Amino acid sequence: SPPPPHLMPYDHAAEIIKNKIKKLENPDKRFLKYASPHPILASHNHILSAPETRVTTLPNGLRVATESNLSAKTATVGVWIDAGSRFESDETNGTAHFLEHMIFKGTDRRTVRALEEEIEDIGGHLNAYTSREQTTYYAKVLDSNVNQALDVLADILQNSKFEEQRINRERDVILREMQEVEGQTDEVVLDHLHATAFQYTPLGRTILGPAQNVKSITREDLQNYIKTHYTASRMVIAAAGAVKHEEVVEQVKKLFTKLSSDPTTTSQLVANEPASFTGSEVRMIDDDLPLAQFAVAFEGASWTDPDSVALMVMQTMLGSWNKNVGGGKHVGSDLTQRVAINEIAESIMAFNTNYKDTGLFGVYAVAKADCLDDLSYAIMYEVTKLAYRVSDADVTRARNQLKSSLLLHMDGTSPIAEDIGRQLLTYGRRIPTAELFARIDAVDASTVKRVANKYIYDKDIAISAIGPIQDLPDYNKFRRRTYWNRY
């Protein structure tokens, strides 16, 4: 007689796993009645009802935009300026970043101690951020201190002192940063990508600028920069939260009186010095680094180009992923599936950068040296596949994810304020959610194929890589992988 099917240790363990499997065989329909794995395009214009965004253009061309939520206890108010490193010159490059460092260094009325002590007396926050085409200073304060924050912003923008000793002290802080450009290689790979893709254009320069420029920065250079660029028609004052439109507009009229009024316009500057894409690459070989990071980018679309919306959907189709994501092997993005299933990267991210007249569309990835060859094949395959095969399910799911992400990231007064300021600068208006969702919904599978055929298929690319990148495919291998010869 043979043993019963529990005596042997291996037989007993086989019974346990067989019982667990039978348990999974019979699902319960109470928990399978609403959720569905099939993506469906849904129209819910009713739920996207939002507070009105009031826009007022002042006599001098100054624009004041507010989003009123009087239920909130705090508010975010700030100035968004159409100025950046793109609008400087080769000799003046780096002044905008220098100005950001010196903008909180005291005015005629308030010293540096007076400025900081005033702000943290009310528990406020002062933020300054400058990019290639946009500069912003904003304050997060309580509801009662909106008027006080507006006074602070107007004073620093109009009556900054720029002491000689403070300029010299700040000259060394930035010079130290320019020699310590390390520890954040994401900001370095993209900086080199801009430098090589936008060669010999204003858009290829870095925000920091060259070390000789910061060494030559004086008081007059900073004053000339403000007088040239910080003009009434290039500035937008955006407030969100517990703010009343009338009170903000009245205070803006009172404070922002001595603006430059220089007739320089942002559309003429872009026209006279246009940005163009050049296929090229920069490879920073360093075998001591443990991980290799690279970015391959195509020429993208400008802000107001209607294909930019389709590029946002295409960016969601490629997706983003890192090792700490739990379900990378099951997401709808095929590129993420290939990376997560075969473990050929530490992180991957598709980016879509828009500018006034051009843009960048590409993929940034971090991986070990021995994964670079298979990773490069996977990235180029899935990017090129967008011009050949696009499923309706994939494009619908990316449409659903793009809608959700654009509204779920608008949480807080500060994100709303920057959405108001950024849109008023790039589009000249705040695009209502309903219109934005209607443009996203117009991007179907045929639209994706047409846009990919225009930007991706048989197009030159820009690569910026750093680290142990000896096994990264060369330019000709990437260039060849932009089309399929079987079609």
């Binding site: 050949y388 095969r389 079987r486 079609y487």
Partner: peptide, 28 residues
Amino acid sequence: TIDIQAAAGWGIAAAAGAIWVVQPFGWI
């Protein structure tokens, strides 16, 4: 619906090559 166009495109190439290697102009 591009696999079908791929097949039709390659069928034209196969026909074009066949008339090119074998040139049966004196037979048609």
